[PDB]
Amino acid sequence: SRKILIRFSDYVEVADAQDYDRRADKPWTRLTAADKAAIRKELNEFKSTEMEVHELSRHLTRFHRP
Amino acid sequence: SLNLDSIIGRLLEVQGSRPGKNVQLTENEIRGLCLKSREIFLSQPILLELEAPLKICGDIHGQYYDLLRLFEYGGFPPESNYLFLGDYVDRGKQSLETICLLLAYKIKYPENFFLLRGNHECASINRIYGFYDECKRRYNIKLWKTFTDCFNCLPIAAIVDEKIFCCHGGLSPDLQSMEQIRRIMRPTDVPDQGLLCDLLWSDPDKDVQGWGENDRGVSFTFGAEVVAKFLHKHDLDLICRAHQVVEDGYEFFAKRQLVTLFSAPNYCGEFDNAGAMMSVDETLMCSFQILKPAGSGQQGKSSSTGNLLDK
Ligand SMILES: [Mn+2]
Ligand SMILES: [Mn+2]
Numbered sequence: 001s002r003k004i005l006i007r008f009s010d011y012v013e014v015a016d017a018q019d020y021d022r023r024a025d026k027p028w029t030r031l032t033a034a035d036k037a038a039i040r041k042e043l044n045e046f047k048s049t050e051m052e053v054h055e056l057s058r059h060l061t062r063f064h065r066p
Numbered sequence: 067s068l069n070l071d072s073i074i075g076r077l078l079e080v081q082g083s084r085p086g087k088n089v090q091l092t093e094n095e096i097r098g099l100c101l102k103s104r105e106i107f108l109s110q111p112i113l114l115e116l117e118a119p120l121k122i123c124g125d126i127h128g129q130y131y132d133l134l135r136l137f138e139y140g141g142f143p144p145e146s147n148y149l150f151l152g153d154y155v156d157r158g159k160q161s162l163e164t165i166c167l168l169l170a171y172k173i174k175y176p177e178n179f180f181l182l183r184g185n186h187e188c189a190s191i192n193r194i195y196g197f198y199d200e201c202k203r204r205y206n207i208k209l210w211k212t213f214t215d216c217f218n219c220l221p222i223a224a225i226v227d228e229k230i231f232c233c234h235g236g237l238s239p240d241l242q243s244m245e246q247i248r249r250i251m252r253p254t255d256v257p258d259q260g261l262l263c264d265l266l267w268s269d270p271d272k273d274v275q276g277w278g279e280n281d282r283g284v285s286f287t288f289g290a291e292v293v294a295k296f297l298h299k300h301d302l303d304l305i306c307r308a309h310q311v312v313e314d315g316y317e318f319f320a321k322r323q324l325v326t327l328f329s330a331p332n333y334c335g336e337f338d339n340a341g342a343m344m345s346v347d348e349t350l351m352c353s354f355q356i357l358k359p360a361g362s363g364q365q366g367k368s369s370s371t372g373n374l375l376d377k
Contacts, residue, residue, distance in 0.1 A: 005229055006303040008322060009353035012314075014340075015139055017357040018131050020085030023335035024159045028194040028374055036375050043190055043375075047255065051189065052215060057254035060262060062190050064375055 040064035068098045070173060077167045081138070085131045089163050093205050096166060100216040103169040106176050107219040113247045114149075114180055114224035118346040121355075122149045122232065124308030124315075124327030125184065128158025128196070132331055132341060132357065133167065139355055140343055144175045149224055151308035151327060152184020152234035152266070155213075156195035157334055157370070162204060165213070183220035184234040184308065185266040185370070188256040192217075194374055218253035222265055227350060229303040236307050236324075237288050237296055238264030239277050244300070258284065258372060267372070269310060270319045270326075284372040290320035297323055304352075306344065311368040315342025315356045325352075332359040337368055 031039070044063050047053075053061055073095055080087045121140045126133050140146050154168055155161035171179045186192050192210075201210040223233040225244075240246070240261040250262060257263050267285035270293070271278060278287040293305060305324040310317075311333050317326045331341035340358035347353075 002298060002301070004303050005227075005350050007349075007351045009351055011353070013353075013355045014358050015135075015356070017331040017341065017359045018085060018135055019360060020131060021335060022129060022132075022159065022332050024128065024157060024196065025199070027196060027199050031194070031374075033377070037377065039193060040375050040377075043193060046211070047189065050211065051218070051255070052253050053218070053255060054251040054253055056251040060257040060260070061255045062188075062258050064190070065377065 037066065040066055068102060068173070069095055070170060073099070073166070074170050074174065077163060077170065078134070078142070081134045086159060088160065088204075089166070091166060093209060096162070096205070096209060097212055099166055099169040099173065100212045103172045104216040104219045106172060107216075107221060108252060110176075110221065111248065112221045112223075112250055112252060113244060114182075114221050116149060116180060116224050116226045118227050118348050118350060120147045120149050120226060120346050122151065122226075122306055122327060122344045122346065123329045124151050124342070125153035125330055126150070126158075126164055127153055127186075127330050127334065128155055128161035128164050128200075129330045130160035130163040130167070132329070133164055135357055136329060136341065136343060139357065140345070143171045144178050147178045149180045149226070149232060150182065151232060151306070152182050152220075153186045153308060154181070154184070155197040156186045156192050158196070158330070161197045161200050169216070180224065181220060182224060182232065182234060183217065183222055183256075183266060185256065185372075187217040187220055189214045190256075190375070191370065191372065195370060215253060218255060222250065222262065223247055225302075226346060228301070229350060230306050230346065231300070231302050231304070232306045233265045234307060235264065235266045235285065235309045236268035236270060236305070237292060238268060239286065240264065241296075267309075270324055272319070282369055282371045290323070293320040293323045311337055311339050313339050315340040315358075316344060316354050331357050333368060336365070
């Protein structure tokens with residue numbers, strides 16, 4: 001069997017997290033169909049014309065169906 | 067001039083203020099952080115080879131005051147060395163302060179401070195999950211585009227002491243050799259499928275044999291036997307990943323062959339989880355330090371997806 005180097009400690013440390021209101025806006029729940037279409041178009045144009053991508057990675061650029 | 071020490075001091079000084087206080091950086095200060103960090107990322111490998119001692123942290127999601135508390139506990143750089151696993155921005159109140167402090171520390175301590183790419187460090191995701199809107203409110207869309215160029219150059223995975231494989235998401239059916247990671251060229255986007263997608267998006271699932279469908283609608287799930295075979299093939303001991311909220315801030319899978327880390331306590335004020343970091347000492351002993359808070363109408367998921375823009 002294979003020799004394992006890693007070990008885990010059973011003794012965990014805990015500290016009290018900050019008490020504050022962490023709630024944040026959810027803009028992705030406020031998109032009409034037309035808004036989504038506009039964002040797909042915006043992203044596609046940005047990625048095609050402005051966003052630098054290495055030649056060997058242009059096949060990875062993620063386009064959205066308009 | 068980068069004005070780096072002034073930037074760091076201003077980012078840190080709000081630790082004694084009420085939670086949520088913004089830090090007033092200039093547009094050109096933030097641009098400089100993006101451009102200089104990007105240069106450093108490109109100068110280092112896309113598959114980082116790191117050595118302990120190190121503290122490893124999972125998702126932060128703009129919870130800047132929790133990031134400050136995490137650094138207070140672990141030691142502010144350069145007192146400890148850090149590796150973060152991605153998901154710095156989106157789905158929180160202060161993505162800008164969060165990413166600016168992380169980039170400033172990367173520039174200041176480039177051999178002692180490391181950042182991997184999460185699935186939120188890409189344009190299609192952070193366009194909609196909050197970061198674009200935060201940039202627009204405080205600065206402009208051009209600044210968001212500058213951040214995108216920086217994010218497109220983040221490294222994707224790390225191996226610690228030849229034994230801990232780290233990435234945001236998880237394994238891929240397309241990952242047969244580490245050379246496949248090393249061959250990925252930056253800047254790059256994150257695709258909707260393939261190796262780079264899976265490294266940033268996949269999840270473990272105890273009830274999957276092999277590779278399965280992912281509830282997110284992107285990438286895959288993978289089972290415990292996939293983990294075991296991967297570790298055996300590559301002579302590794304642990305996969306360390308992030309990307310899922312877990313109650314204690316850390317959670318094991320596959321008889322401790324994988325761990326999930328999540329560093330944002332009380333995630334977005336809707337979940338009752340702790341945030342954790344994993345410390346790896348020079349003997350390869352791993353330990354945990356946690357910051358713990360005090361029908362169809364069921365609570366929503368905490369996970370993100372890649373298909374929210376679909377027509
Ligand atoms: Mn996340
Ligand atoms: Mn994620």
